[PDB]
Design an enzyme around this catalytic site. Structure first.
Site, PDB file in Angstrom:
ATOM      1  N   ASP A   1     -67.247   1.450 -38.605  1.00  0.00           N
ATOM      2  CA  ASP A   1     -67.148   2.904 -38.632  1.00  0.00           C
ATOM      3  C   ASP A   1     -67.334   3.527 -37.258  1.00  0.00           C
ATOM      4  O   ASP A   1     -67.151   4.742 -37.112  1.00  0.00           O
ATOM      5  CB  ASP A   1     -68.194   3.489 -39.585  1.00  0.00           C
ATOM      6  CG  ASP A   1     -69.613   3.125 -39.184  1.00  0.00           C
ATOM      7  OD1 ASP A   1     -69.799   2.075 -38.529  1.00  0.00           O
ATOM      8  OD2 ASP A   1     -70.540   3.899 -39.510  1.00  0.00           O
TER       9      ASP A   1
ATOM     10  N   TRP B   1     -74.329   4.754 -36.701  1.00  0.00           N
ATOM     11  CA  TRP B   1     -74.733   6.028 -37.291  1.00  0.00           C
ATOM     12  C   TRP B   1     -76.155   6.405 -36.891  1.00  0.00           C
ATOM     13  O   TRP B   1     -76.405   7.536 -36.459  1.00  0.00           O
ATOM     14  CB  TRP B   1     -74.606   5.989 -38.813  1.00  0.00           C
ATOM     15  CG  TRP B   1     -74.838   7.336 -39.397  1.00  0.00           C
ATOM     16  CD1 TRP B   1     -75.886   7.726 -40.170  1.00  0.00           C
ATOM     17  CD2 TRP B   1     -74.007   8.491 -39.230  1.00  0.00           C
ATOM     18  NE1 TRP B   1     -75.759   9.052 -40.505  1.00  0.00           N
ATOM     19  CE2 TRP B   1     -74.611   9.544 -39.939  1.00  0.00           C
ATOM     20  CE3 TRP B   1     -72.807   8.732 -38.555  1.00  0.00           C
ATOM     21  CZ2 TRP B   1     -74.055  10.820 -39.993  1.00  0.00           C
ATOM     22  CZ3 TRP B   1     -72.258  10.000 -38.608  1.00  0.00           C
ATOM     23  CH2 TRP B   1     -72.882  11.028 -39.321  1.00  0.00           C
ATOM     24  N   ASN B   2     -77.102   5.471 -37.021  1.00  0.00           N
ATOM     25  CA  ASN B   2     -78.501   5.804 -36.764  1.00  0.00           C
ATOM     26  C   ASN B   2     -78.729   6.159 -35.300  1.00  0.00           C
ATOM     27  O   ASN B   2     -79.483   7.091 -34.991  1.00  0.00           O
ATOM     28  CB  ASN B   2     -79.406   4.655 -37.206  1.00  0.00           C
ATOM     29  CG  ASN B   2     -79.422   4.480 -38.716  1.00  0.00           C
ATOM     30  OD1 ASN B   2     -80.012   5.287 -39.434  1.00  0.00           O
ATOM     31  ND2 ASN B   2     -78.757   3.437 -39.204  1.00  0.00           N
TER      32      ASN B   2
ATOM     33  N   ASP C   1     -78.261   1.127 -52.185  1.00  0.00           N
ATOM     34  CA  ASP C   1     -77.381   1.268 -51.039  1.00  0.00           C
ATOM     35  C   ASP C   1     -75.931   1.095 -51.477  1.00  0.00           C
ATOM     36  O   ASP C   1     -75.635   0.756 -52.625  1.00  0.00           O
ATOM     37  CB  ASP C   1     -77.754   0.254 -49.957  1.00  0.00           C
ATOM     38  CG  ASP C   1     -77.409   0.734 -48.558  1.00  0.00           C
ATOM     39  OD1 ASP C   1     -76.351   1.380 -48.387  1.00  0.00           O
ATOM     40  OD2 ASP C   1     -78.208   0.473 -47.633  1.00  0.00           O
TER      41      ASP C   1
ATOM     42  N   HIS D   1     -79.967   0.446 -42.120  1.00  0.00           N
ATOM     43  CA  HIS D   1     -80.071   0.874 -43.508  1.00  0.00           C
ATOM     44  C   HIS D   1     -81.526   0.916 -43.938  1.00  0.00           C
ATOM     45  O   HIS D   1     -81.954   1.841 -44.636  1.00  0.00           O
ATOM     46  CB  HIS D   1     -79.280  -0.074 -44.405  1.00  0.00           C
ATOM     47  CG  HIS D   1     -77.812  -0.078 -44.125  1.00  0.00           C
ATOM     48  ND1 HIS D   1     -76.892   0.473 -44.990  1.00  0.00           N
ATOM     49  CD2 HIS D   1     -77.101  -0.582 -43.087  1.00  0.00           C
ATOM     50  CE1 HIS D   1     -75.678   0.325 -44.489  1.00  0.00           C
ATOM     51  NE2 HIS D   1     -75.778  -0.316 -43.338  1.00  0.00           N
TER      52      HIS D   1
HETATM   53  O1  LIG Z   1     -83.251  -2.038 -29.302  1.00  0.00           O
HETATM   54  C1  LIG Z   1     -83.128  -1.401 -30.348  1.00  0.00           C
HETATM   55  C2  LIG Z   1     -81.958  -1.365 -31.178  1.00  0.00           C
HETATM   56  C3  LIG Z   1     -81.963  -0.621 -32.295  1.00  0.00           C
HETATM   57  N1  LIG Z   1     -83.058   0.112 -32.690  1.00  0.00           N
HETATM   58  C4  LIG Z   1     -83.039   0.926 -33.920  1.00  0.00           C
HETATM   59  O2  LIG Z   1     -82.336   0.225 -34.924  1.00  0.00           O
HETATM   60  C5  LIG Z   1     -81.402   1.121 -35.583  1.00  0.00           C
HETATM   61  C6  LIG Z   1     -80.007   0.763 -35.140  1.00  0.00           C
HETATM   62  O3  LIG Z   1     -79.090   1.793 -35.575  1.00  0.00           O
HETATM   63  P1  LIG Z   1     -77.555   1.358 -35.713  1.00  0.00           P
HETATM   64  O4  LIG Z   1     -77.115   0.704 -34.445  1.00  0.00           O
HETATM   65  O5  LIG Z   1     -76.757   2.494 -36.263  1.00  0.00           O
HETATM   66  O6  LIG Z   1     -77.702   0.228 -36.841  1.00  0.00           O
HETATM   67  P2  LIG Z   1     -77.285  -1.319 -36.897  1.00  0.00           P
HETATM   68  O7  LIG Z   1     -77.776  -1.903 -38.182  1.00  0.00           O
HETATM   69  O8  LIG Z   1     -77.678  -1.983 -35.618  1.00  0.00           O
HETATM   70  O9  LIG Z   1     -75.686  -1.174 -36.954  1.00  0.00           O
HETATM   71  C7  LIG Z   1     -75.041  -0.724 -38.117  1.00  0.00           C
HETATM   72  O10 LIG Z   1     -75.199   0.675 -38.287  1.00  0.00           O
HETATM   73  C8  LIG Z   1     -74.483   1.216 -39.425  1.00  0.00           C
HETATM   74  C9  LIG Z   1     -75.471   2.060 -40.201  1.00  0.00           C
HETATM   75  O11 LIG Z   1     -76.653   1.331 -40.541  1.00  0.00           O
HETATM   76  C10 LIG Z   1     -73.851   0.086 -40.255  1.00  0.00           C
HETATM   77  O12 LIG Z   1     -73.146   0.631 -41.369  1.00  0.00           O
HETATM   78  C11 LIG Z   1     -72.925  -0.779 -39.404  1.00  0.00           C
HETATM   79  O13 LIG Z   1     -72.658  -2.006 -40.082  1.00  0.00           O
HETATM   80  C12 LIG Z   1     -73.561  -1.077 -38.058  1.00  0.00           C
HETATM   81  O14 LIG Z   1     -72.922  -0.302 -37.047  1.00  0.00           O
HETATM   82  C13 LIG Z   1     -81.888   2.523 -35.193  1.00  0.00           C
HETATM   83  O15 LIG Z   1     -83.007   2.903 -35.982  1.00  0.00           O
HETATM   84  C14 LIG Z   1     -82.333   2.271 -33.748  1.00  0.00           C
HETATM   85  O16 LIG Z   1     -83.253   3.219 -33.248  1.00  0.00           O
HETATM   86  C15 LIG Z   1     -84.217   0.135 -31.937  1.00  0.00           C
HETATM   87  O17 LIG Z   1     -85.206   0.779 -32.263  1.00  0.00           O
HETATM   88  N2  LIG Z   1     -84.184  -0.637 -30.804  1.00  0.00           N
END
Ligand SMILES: O=c1ccn([C@@H]2O[C@H](COP(=O)(O)OP(=O)(O)O[C@H]3O[C@H](CO)[C@@H](O)[C@H](O)[C@H]3O)[C@@H](O)[C@H]2O)c(=O)[nH]1
Length: 429
Positions: free
Chosen positions: A347, A326-327, A113, A14
């Site tokens: 999700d 998502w990201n 958010d 986020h």
């Molecule tokens: O080793 C790593 C791991 C992650 N990332 C970055 O971190 C973010 C991770 O993305 P994502 O896995 O989608 O986000 P998280 O916060 O880890 O997970 C959440 O991603 C969704 C969107 O943020 C949330 O709604 C959910 O609770 C959950 O799945 C992205 O920018 C990645 O590129 C890195 O750069 N390096």
């Protein structure tokens, strides 16, 4: 001279999307106040270049602090799952501090958010406009709201059906789907998506909510070389499109059985791999005993954190085994990597379906009890990466990447129009 205060939800994914939104607004003569917890702010600052010191100012939100729950744990990045309810409580208990910041900064607009309902209400109390920014996809949201109005019919535009494992707080979220709106602040929502993937769902969601849906995505960060030096050295020795990146996010820690299945699935595929394995902030065995054998120099296990964006943009990477966050999904589509989906919760199952629908990847199906399968993972890796015999998947991935790369600065034209109109209506108030 027009100031916007941005308040993301805790959690790296986020936080990054808000930052990309902040950068766009800064370049458009908008003074930005980026507000979050100190731990999150520090984690995100490297991605902000020096040129924004004048236009993007960091604001610290203070959560309740205790000696065993200090501010470094005031985030979802590496947080033990047991501690998450405390984090939700601590975030809610910070509302009064938010008022002091908000009243003292006097922002013309608040962008918030989708996980802090106290934030719009605090803004309303102080006569401050507020607009919702949703960092995640539209597919999940529309599917959730469809039964309320049409419990009768099926989802109209999708052929995807959820699996039984995930069919199975929510209480407070089914009170957000009936949220009243009687002002322009809530006339529009900002969404981190684009119509080429979710255009039909965006149109449907607009009808369901009776509100404007403005896409401003995707918001991917194109990349200190902190860990990249060793990884790039290793990656360059491999043939093009020969390596898979394996990541399951920052807010989920796979089980002992789950990681065994994926590890064995990787070994059977014979592919090269870079796997980020993480342990909770609180505290070889987790992977199968002897796993790193056939995968001697044909695999890497990075501890703690890795440069995901840099690895995915390498020309040796032909696949991404992902939890379909998502990201990560947006990054893989932007960079043209086909996704091998292994969704875990939240999700992610819907996002894995969306990847499958778009043709940019394949989802590894869970067994009837919801258990990861070694053979399923290996088959898709071999087909997608080791033996490139699922060439339709590969072509759509670069075609999707080509489409995403070609988008210019018009991506934010709609958003600036809506905020400008709203900022005028409040002068009258
Ligand atoms: O080793 C790593 C791991 C992650 N990332 C970055 O971190 C973010 C991770 O993305 P994502 O896995 O989608 O986000 P998280 O916060 O880890 O997970 C959440 O991603 C969704 C969107 O943020 C949330 O709604 C959910 O609770 C959950 O799945 C992205 O920018 C990645 O590129 C890195 O750069 N390096």
């Amino acid at each position: 001279t027009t100031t916007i205060l941005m308040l993301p939800w805790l959690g790296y994914g986020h936080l990054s999307a808000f930052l990309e939104l902040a950068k766009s607004l800064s370049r458009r003569n908008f003074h930005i106040y980026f507000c979050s917890t100190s731990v999150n702010l520090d984690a995100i600052k490297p991605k902000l270049p020096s040129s924004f010191s004048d236009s993007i100012q960091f604001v610290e939100l203070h959560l309740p602090s205790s000696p065993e729950f200090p501010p470094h744990l005031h985030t979802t990045n590496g947080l033990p799952p047991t501690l998450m309810p405390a984090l939700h409580q601590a975030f809610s208990m910070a509302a009064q501090h938010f008022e002091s910041i908000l009243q003292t900064l006097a922002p013309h607009l608040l962008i918030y958010d989708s996980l802090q309902p106290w934030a719009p209400r605090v803004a309303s109390s102080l006569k401050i406009p507020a607009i919702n920014f949703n960092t995640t996809g539209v597919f999940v949201i529309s599917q959730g709201l469809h039964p309320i109005h049409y419990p009768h019919s099926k989802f109209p535009f999708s052929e995807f059906v959820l699996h039984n494992h995930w069919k199975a707080e929510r209480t407070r979220k089914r009170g957000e789907a009936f949220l009243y709106c009687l002002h322009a602040s809530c006339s529009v929502i900002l969404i981190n998506s684009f119509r080429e993937l979710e255009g039909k769902y965006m149109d449907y969601l607009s009808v369901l909510l009776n509100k404007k849906v403005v896409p401003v995505g995707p918001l991917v960060y194109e990349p200190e070389d902190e860990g990249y030096s060793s990884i790039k050295n290793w990656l360059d020795k491999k043939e093009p499109s020969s390596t898979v990146f394996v990541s399951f996010g920052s807010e989920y820690f796979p089980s002992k059985e789950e990681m065994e299945e994926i590890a064995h699935g990787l070994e059977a595929s014979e592919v090269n791999f870079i796997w980020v394995v993480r342990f909770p902030q609180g505290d070889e065995d987790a992977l199968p005993k002897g796993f790193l054998e056939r995968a001697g120099e044909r695999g890497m296990v990075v501890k703690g954190w890795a440069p995901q964006a840099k690895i995915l943009k390498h020309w040796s990477t032909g696949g991404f085994v992902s939890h379909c966050g998502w990201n990560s999904v947006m990054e893989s589509m932007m960079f043209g990597v086909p996704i091998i989906g292994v969704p875990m919760h939240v999700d992610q199952p819907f996002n894995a379906g969306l990847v499958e629908e778009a043709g940019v990847g394949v989802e590894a199906k869970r067994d009837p009890d919801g258990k990861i399968q070694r053979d399923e993972v290996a088959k898709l890796i071999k087909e997608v990466v080791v033996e490139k015999t699922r060439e339709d998947v590969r072509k759509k991935a670069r075609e999707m990447s080509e489409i995403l790369r070609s988008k210019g600065e018009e991506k934010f034209d709609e958003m600036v129009a809506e905020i400008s109109l709203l900022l005028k209506i409040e002068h009258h108030h």
